[PDB]
Amino acid sequence: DIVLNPLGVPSRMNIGQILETHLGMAAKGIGDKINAMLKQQQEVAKLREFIQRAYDLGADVRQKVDLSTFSDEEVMRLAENLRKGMPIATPVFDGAKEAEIKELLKLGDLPTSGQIRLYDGRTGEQFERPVTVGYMYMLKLNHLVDDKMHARSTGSYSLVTQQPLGGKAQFGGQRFGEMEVWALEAYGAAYTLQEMLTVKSDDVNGRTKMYKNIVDGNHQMEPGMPESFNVLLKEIRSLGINIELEDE
């Protein structure tokens, strides 16, 4: 059901993932046998040894369980609840070694190498080498795709600088960062930068005319003047400093 990537194993150095997968493979394999004997509805006695056989596996383990105390109905209920896989507990720094995992898998009917053959669904042919297959715990993060989809063609406009708003809540656009501006100047792209900085950001005359022209078919911008620049002028004119343009 899930196809992971092996090349993320060496660089990330998270080799515990492979061991966790191998342990998971043995756990589910144990459940199948319990599932199989439950399907045949075998006697409680046949259960009592087998579940004891799994728990008795392990060297000097601190978890000692006596199934003889459990009644027949308790064993039946536990086995029914156990058919989805035997839970394996592992202390953070006292976990079982590779040999213990191999011995546990030996109780099952799986190859000791933990790599079974596979057949491709599209081609139906056996792969060249055995492949690792097992069970893993998966988490769905709290970053939904539709919570990040956001696009604006023409929404609202700021009252201070006459620029499009920012943020998904207000149909905000995208901030064309300064690094992106230098990236554009790196190419020969001058027309794109000019139009993006004049007729789509703040030029009241431009974006009004541009919106009409594109509907009418024409694809042609007009220079205009960025109203943000005018603000700065007034801001500079707000102080004792005098600034002004010159003749055309």
d(CA 24, CA 89): 11
Name the DSSP letter for residue 68. Answer: G
Nearer to other proteins, 53 or 84 (CB): 84
Partner from RNA, other proteins, DNA, none contacting 62, C-beta within 5 to 8 A by type: none
- Residue 66, both tokens: 């006596």
Identify which range of 39-47, 64-72, 95-103, 154-162 contacts RNA by CB under 7 A: 154-162
Under the binding rule (CB under 7 A), the answer on residue 156 touching DNA is: no
Partner from DNA, other proteins, RNA, none contacting 3, C-beta within 5 to 8 A by type: other proteins
* Near DNA in 39-58, by CB under 7 A: none
Q: Return the sign of the alpha-carbon dihedral for residues 89, 92, 96, 98.
A: positive
Contacting residue, 44, 86, 165, 209, with other proteins by CB under 8 A: 165
Locate tokens 């009418």: which residue?
216
The residue count for binding RNA (CB under 7 A) is: 7
Q: CB-hemisphere CA count at 13 Å for 73?
A: 0
Name the DSSP letter for residue 129. Answer: S
CB-CB neighbours of 120 under 10 Å = 9
* Near other proteins in 57-96, by CB under 8 A: 85, 93, 95
- The residues that touch DNA, with contacts defined as CB under 7 A, are 147, 150, 166-169, 172, 174-175, 177-179
